[PDB]
Write a protein that binds this ligand. Structure first.
Ligand SMILES: [Zn+2]
Lengths: 31, 159, 49, 66, 58, 48, 347, 126
RNA sequence: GAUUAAUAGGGACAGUCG
RNA sequence: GUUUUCAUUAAUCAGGAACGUAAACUAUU
């Protein structure tokens, strides 16, 4: 697998797509 | 208009009067012209180049007739670079200032090149068809633009 | 070992730089029997002679 | 105007289709022209350049040609 | 495959080249001093600081 | 945490798609056991 | 072709990021420094290639230029500015002992042969000359109406006070220093990534140009190129004349190092390695026998020129056999079998 | 059609650094792409760019950068969220940066932590 | 009072083409 | 192709509308 792909959301070419559940998950990890 | 005459303002007024009379046989936007505005700030070191400010449709009148008018002005006036412009009071205004600075030639390109850091340099490349008699005027164009607007540019011919 | 391959050298230089015998030639080429535009020009020349 | 040329084209293809009435490619192209006309006319209603009650199905065609 | 496919570059004619080689280098056909003077290379680099030249030689 | 020349050689033998892993491997604060052997086969170097 | 084993070594553990600049000590023989991309510079001694002699986190951006002085000190150039360190002192001093920022974004460095002057090519279209120990801000020389970045700069070594430099207007320009004014300007067809003078002939220069080519020019007559080596695939990122002035190294943007003869015009040899990710700076050592290649993989590799000629003292019959083989090939190098095996190389 | 001209330009940048070019022709220009190149030039992942007009951008690059992209929902982000976001986004805290159209402009995350300003996570490169 | 005029669109004209 | 115009009019498809004996080896590159 590619190593440099970040682990949060999906990556298609250059665009990076994050779902709102993943963003709220990161916010919950902060709080 | 606006101006009460100064030491070169009455000079350019007398100059346009003796271009009306005692000569050609060519006077189109000269008779509908009075005192307009003028400025004389130095260029380089030792030299000067006069700029005049003209109302806005008389610019296309002078674009109809600017060839050899500017030449006669250079020869019978102090042996310096004469230059004509539109008087105004934003980046479109700087665009008009540049395209009215370069009167017979059309500009082609504006290369805004940043350096390796936050500094940036703007260079305007002109047409290739007129190169012979404008290269000695290029520095005057640059310093005049610098004095009027403040952005440093540099004029260049392509290759 | 080292002499010129003369045919190879003349071909390399070509690539860089770019009334008794025709009777037996036509006899040789009339047994093929390809029409052969060079044979055509040669037959026109033999008509001219 | 763009809408004027388009409704003239629609009038033309409609007259030919009425004279012939057998082909289907004319019908398909008339459908596409009607869709383009309706989208453009919608844009022009929104910008307000013509009365909002101005409609065209066939009587606007017959009146503009008569 | 043992004939040469063409002239080497600097030469100008077949007679020139095929008559300029003309002599084997190895010691079986030449004296020792001539073998040395023939196989002595053009550039001779001993070790050390090969600095750029200071003043012209001639 | 130590990293051998064999492991570094395999990360370098892998192409430029692993440039990020090569940089993290060459993080400076980590010891580096140089190896005295031939094949640069990291499994046999580690086991030896 | 059996005994061509050119790769010798790798200078220690290398850098974190890529090796983007390096320079040798033209006075010494085993002093080299390499400035990486994260802004650390390292000074290596070539006798012991295990660990570096002196390292420091020099700048914030990449280390674009670097050189040794003539006394013992070294200069580094980055977009932050340039700095002067002394790596050889009985205390290790990581702080710089001189610093410059004014003059715009500096891009390259080159040091004089004899005196304590050096030139830095800036980005504002000028180079500027400092004379150490009695100057502060340095004199800026420039073409009159000039804008674009002057990429590389190099003092002529054999003739002092002649400065060659290349700008990104796809142009080379020559200066003079006794009369502080630019002299000549030629525009080529493609940009040139480096200029280098010849340390044996005073007037020949070589430009490594993005045309995938290496041009040898005569500085007196810029009308036609003296020689055109065309052997590369990507742009050339570095050229370096031999200190004996007869061979050339060219390190490319692709995975190659090409060794060349001065009048050949084609690849005498080519080096490549999977571990080398790109190639950025190659230079000889003053032996003219071992070349050094700073890669973009963060390695400073040490290869040997004449890739089948072992070093050290040779016995006399052995050196006779080697010179005999070499003269023999110089005679019979054009027959088919000899030609194909001498040209055949694994790329 | 991806109206994200920013994403188009960054796709061309990634294609160029993958293929091994030296300069690109980013066809549609915009001020956000200009400032994004400004911050990558600050961090030295790009040689030197120029914007010319009909306009387009020509970007001399050295070949140091690995990946670039744009965060498509353009998520607003505070400080503790910024720290955890940057550790979830980059492969390392010391390699690469993340971009924020802050209220103070467009800047990298170390500048955001210097100026104590939060903002919208938009882009990233390493 | 009314920007670039888009390397997204539609329209007109001319010579064509199937 | 133009020495031609309007200047977002655009893209996508829920719903909907017009057209209608067979198979059988297979942002660039
Ligand atoms: Zn090992």
């Amino acid at each position: 697998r590619p190593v440099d792909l970040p682990a949060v959301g999906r990556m298609r070419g250059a665009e990076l797509r994050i779902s709102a559940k993943e963003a709220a998950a990161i916010a919950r990890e902060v709080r | 208009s606006r101006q009460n005459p100064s030491d070169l303002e009455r000079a350019i007024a007398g100059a346009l009067y003796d271009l009306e009379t005692n000569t050609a046989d060519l006077k189109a936007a000269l008779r509908p012209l009075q005192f307009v505005s003028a400025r004389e700030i130095e260029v380089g070191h030792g030299k000067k180049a006069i700029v005049i400010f003209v109302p806005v449709p008389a610019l296309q009148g002078f674009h109809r007739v600017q060839q050899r008018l500017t030449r006669e002005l250079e020869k019978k006036f102090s042996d310096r670079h004469v230059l004509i412009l539109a008087a105004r009071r934003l980046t479109a205004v700087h665009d008009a200032i540049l395209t009215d600075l370069v009167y017979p030639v059309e500009i082609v390109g504006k290369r805004l090149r940043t350096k390796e850091d936050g500094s940036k340099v703007l260079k305007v490349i002109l047409d290739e068809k007129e190169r012979g008699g404008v290269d000695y005027r290029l520095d005057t164009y640059s310093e005049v633009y610098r004095r009027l607007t403040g952005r440093n540019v540099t004029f260049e011919f392509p290759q | 070992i080292g002499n010129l391959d003369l045919r190879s050298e003349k071909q390399r230089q070509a690539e860089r730089d770019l009334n008794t015998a025709l009777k037996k030639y036509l006899r040789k080429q009339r047994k093929k029997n390809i029409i052969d535009e060079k044979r055509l020009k040669a037959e026109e020349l033999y008509r001219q002679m | 105007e763009d809408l004027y040329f388009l409704i003239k084209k629609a009038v033309a293809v409609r007259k030919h289709l009425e004279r012939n009435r057998k082909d289907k490619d004319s019908k398909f192209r008339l459908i596409l022209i009607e869709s383009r006309i309706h989208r453009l006319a919608r844009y022009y209603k929104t910008v307000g350049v013509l009365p909002p009650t101005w409609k065209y199905e066939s009587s606007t065609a017959s009146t503009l040609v008569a | 495959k043992y004939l040469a496919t063409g002239l080497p570059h600097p030469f100008e004619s077949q007679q020139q080249y095929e008559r300029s080689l003309r002599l084997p280098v190895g010691p079986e056909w030449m004296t020792k001093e001539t073998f040395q003077d023939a196989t002595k290379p053009r550039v001779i680099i001993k070790q050390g600081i090969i600095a750029p030249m200071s003043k012209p030689m001639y | 945490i130590i990293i051998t020349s064999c492991v570094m050689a395999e990360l370098e033998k892998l192409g430029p798609r692993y440039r990020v892993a090569l940089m993290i491997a060459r993080d400076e604060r980590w010891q580096r056991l140089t190896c005295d052997h031939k094949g640069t086969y990291a499994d046999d170097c580690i086991v030896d | 072709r059996m005994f061509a084993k050119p790769f010798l070594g790798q200078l220690g553990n290398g850098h974190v990021q890529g090796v983007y600049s390096m320079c040798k000590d033209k006075n010494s023989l085993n002093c080299i420094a390499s400035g990486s991309g994260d802004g650390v510079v390292k000074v290596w001694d070539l006798t012991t290639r295990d660990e570096e002699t002196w390292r420091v986190a020099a700048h914030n951006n990449i280390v674009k230029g670097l050189t040794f002085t003539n006394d013992k000190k070294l200069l580094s150039c980055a977009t932050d500015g340039i700095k002067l360190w002394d790596p050889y002192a009985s205390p290790s001093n990581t702080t710089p002992i001189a610093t410059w920022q004014e003059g715009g974004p500096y891009t390259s460095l080159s040091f004089h042969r004899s005196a304590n002057t050096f030139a830095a090519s800036s980005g504002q279209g000028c180079i500027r000359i400092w004379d150490l120990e009695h100057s502060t801000a340095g004199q800026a020389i420039q073409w009159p109406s000039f804008v674009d970045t002057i990429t590389d700069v190099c003092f002529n070594q054999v003739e002092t006070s002649v400065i060659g430099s290349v700008a990104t207007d796809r142009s080379i320009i020559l200066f003079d220093l006794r009369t502080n004014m630019p002299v000549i300007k030629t525009v080529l067809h493609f940009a040139c990534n480096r200029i280098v003078f010849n340390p044996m002939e005073a007037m020949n220069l070589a430009v490594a140009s993005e045309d995938h080519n290496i041009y040898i020019f005569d500085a007196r007559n810029f009308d036609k190129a003296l020689n055109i080596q065309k052997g590369h695939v990507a742009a050339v990122m570095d050229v370096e004349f031999s200190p004996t002035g007869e061979e050339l190294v060219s390190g490319s943007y692709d995975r190659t190092i090409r060794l060349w003869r001065r009048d050949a015009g084609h690849s005498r040899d080519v080096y490549h390695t999977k571990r080398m990710q790109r190639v950025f700076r190659t230079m000889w050592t003053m032996d003219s026998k071992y070349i050094l290649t700073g890669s973009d993989d963060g390695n400073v590799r040490l290869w040997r020129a004449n890739a089948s000629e072992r070093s050290g003292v040779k016995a006399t019959r052995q050196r006779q056999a080697l010179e005999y083989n070499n003269a023999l090939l110089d005679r019979y190098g054009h027959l088919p079998e000899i030609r194909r095996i001498r040209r055949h190389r694994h790329l | 059609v991806r109206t994200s001209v920013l994403h188009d330009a960054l796709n061309s940048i990634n294609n160029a650094e993958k293929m091994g070019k030296r300069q690109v022709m980013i066809r549609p220009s915009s001020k956000v792409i200009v400032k994004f190149l400004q911050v990558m030039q600050r961090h030295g992942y790009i040689g030197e760019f120029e914007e010319v007009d009909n306009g387009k951008i020509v970007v001399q690059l050295n070949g140091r950068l690995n990946k670039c992209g744009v965060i498509s929902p353009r998520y607003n982000v505070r400080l503790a969220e910024l720290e955890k976001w940057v550790t979830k986004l980059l492969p390392a805290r010391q390699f690469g940066y993340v971009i924020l159209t802050t209220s103070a402009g467009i800047m990298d995350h170390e500048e955001a932590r210097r100026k104590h300003v939060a903002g919208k996570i938009i882009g990233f490169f390493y």
